[PDB]
Design a protein around this ligand. Structure first.
Ligand code: BMS
Ligand code: OLA
Lengths: 232, 217
């Protein structure tokens, strides 16, 4: 009913801020595992920046997000960015080729993903990307999981956490019904998908640890921007 | 036959069955140790757990004991305020935590766990279920038959939601609201491992070794 519009809305928000793997024309570039490939890192760092921008536009598209204190908006976005990038990139995984494709089509394989910055978290993220395959998620499901993940009333320094919890309620309902409508005989698929947020949290945690490392071994690597971008 | 597979009452039973020098480090260590000693007992009473292969049982526990303990202590502190009531009965105020370097974890337990459980009045059955879900971790490393484990985790999912529909019909999304605690339990559980250098549990005896003994007996 009013849930269908919510679903429709979120799928469009996602579709519009994250093209689908099956629609991307790919492109590339022997090598082996090395500490870091600065030239790969430059493209990756670039694409990431762009995706963060896209993630912010996505959030703004989410029903009621904007009607939240700007401080709250920034806080939720700062807390869930890596989460969403990781979830996003992992939904661009081609198992037969063991590759991950970017929003511009750039397709990297494990070693390249490793050398581009994944470093030690490489096998980690790739395993998670694989755990997602059985879920056979679609646009609406990825968008909903992203929103449920972003609009989290647990994040500290939240002005109106209650308002956040209120905003997430419908998302969880929409995901529950939609997921189960699509997979009629497998009802456990809803908690299964939902609980991926747990694994995603574990990865982004270490992810942020690597992020500080890199911010050090690379001069002027990753300037802050959600805060500022959001304000303007 | 949802509950038939994973009897909510038989889980609540394990919850209750195991139901519980003075300084922060000492208090938490002693509280942790005490619960650690009865964790096998608890797990054993969780439907089908004892039927799994032993070498697997040790893997499931060593993987979620920290989260399992934080879950129980969190719920147990719903009553108290600005602190955590240990299994030893001692109340540890957040100022005590900040005194032992774990002030950040603490505030997080308090606001993301304790206070959320209190606010939704998570009953003892639900907490027990969540713990069971945390027990049957299908991703634990070195698992003999993960599929069997994930299958059981899925059964608890099935039971728990059934239960929430029964007991709280007016709350269609209580099930989800409940599960969303697991993510935060993991975050907090991870941050807690980093402090094990200073909080020496079970006389520094390696966890998995101690667990093995408890089980084999
Ligand atoms: C391993 C780790 C944590 C290292 C650093 C990093 C990262 C994060 N934020 C940035 C912000 C600005 C510049 C570089 C950055 C690099 C990062 C980013 C990702 C990720 O999926 N981002 C990402 C997701 C999607 C796309 C796209 O569709 O085009 C591009 C990048 C995954 C893991 C890591
Ligand atoms: C889970 C025990 C981990 C102990 C090391 C972490 C440092 C302490 C940080 C937060 C304390 C959380 C309270 C856990 C006590 C569990 C035992 C009890 O049930 O009383």
């Amino acid at each position: 009913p009013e849930v269908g519009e919510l679903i429709e809305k979120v799928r469009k928000a996602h579709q519009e801020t994250f093209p689908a793997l099956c629609q991307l024309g790919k492109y590339t570039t022997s090598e082996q595992r090395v500490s870091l490939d600065i030239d790969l890192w430059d493209k990756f760092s670039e694409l990431s920046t762009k995706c963060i921008i896209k993630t912010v536009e996505f959030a703004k598209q989410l029903p009621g997000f904007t009607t939240l204190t700007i401080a709250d908006q920034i806080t939720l976005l700062k807390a869930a960015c890596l989460d969403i990038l990781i979830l996003r990139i992992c939904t661009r995984y081609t198992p037969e080729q063991d590759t991950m494709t970017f929003s511009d089509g750039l397709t990297l394989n494990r070693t390249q993903m490793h050398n581009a910055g994944f470093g030690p978290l490489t096998d980690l993220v790739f395993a998670f990307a694989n755990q997602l395959l059985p879920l056979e998620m679609d646009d609406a499901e990825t968008g909903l999981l992203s929103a449920i993940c972003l609009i989290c009333g647990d994040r500290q320094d939240l002005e109106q956490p209650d308002r956040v919890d209120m905003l997430q309620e419908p998302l969880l309902e929409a995901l529950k019904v939609y997921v189960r409508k699509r997979r009629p005989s497998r009802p456990h698929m809803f908690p299964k998908m939902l609980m991926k947020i747990t694994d995603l949290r574990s990865i982004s945690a270490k992810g942020a640890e690597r992020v500080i490392t890199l911010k050090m071994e690379i001069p002027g690597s990753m300037p802050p921007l959600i805060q500022e971008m959001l304000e303007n | 036959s949802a509950n038939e597979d994973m009897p909510v009452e038989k889980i609540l039973e394990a919850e209750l069955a195991v139901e519980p020098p003075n300084d922060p480090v000492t208090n938490i260590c002693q509280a942790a140790d005490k619960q650690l000693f009865t964790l096998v007992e608890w797990a054993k009473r969780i439907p089908h757990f004892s039927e799994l292969p032993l070498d697997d049982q040790v893997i499931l526990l060593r993987a979620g004991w920290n989260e399992l303990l934080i879950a129980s202590a969190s719920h147990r502190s719903i009553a108290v305020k600005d602190g955590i009531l240990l299994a030893t009965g001692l109340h540890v105020h957040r100022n005590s935590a900040h005194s032992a370097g774990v002030g950040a974890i603490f505030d997080r337990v308090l606001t993301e766990l304790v206070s959320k459980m209190r606010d939704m009045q998570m009953d003892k059955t639900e907490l027990g279920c969540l713990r069971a879900i945390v027990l049957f971790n299908p991703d634990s490393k070195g698992l003999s038959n993960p599929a069997e484990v994930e299958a059981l985790r899925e059964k608890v999912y099935a039971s728990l939601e059934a239960y929430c529909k029964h007991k709280y019909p007016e709350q269609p999304g209580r099930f989800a609201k409940l599960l969303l605690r697991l993510p935060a339990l993991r975050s907090i559980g991870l941050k807690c491992l980093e402090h094990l250098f200073f909080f020496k549990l079970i006389g520094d005896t390696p966890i998995d070794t101690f667990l093995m003994e408890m089980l084999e007996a």
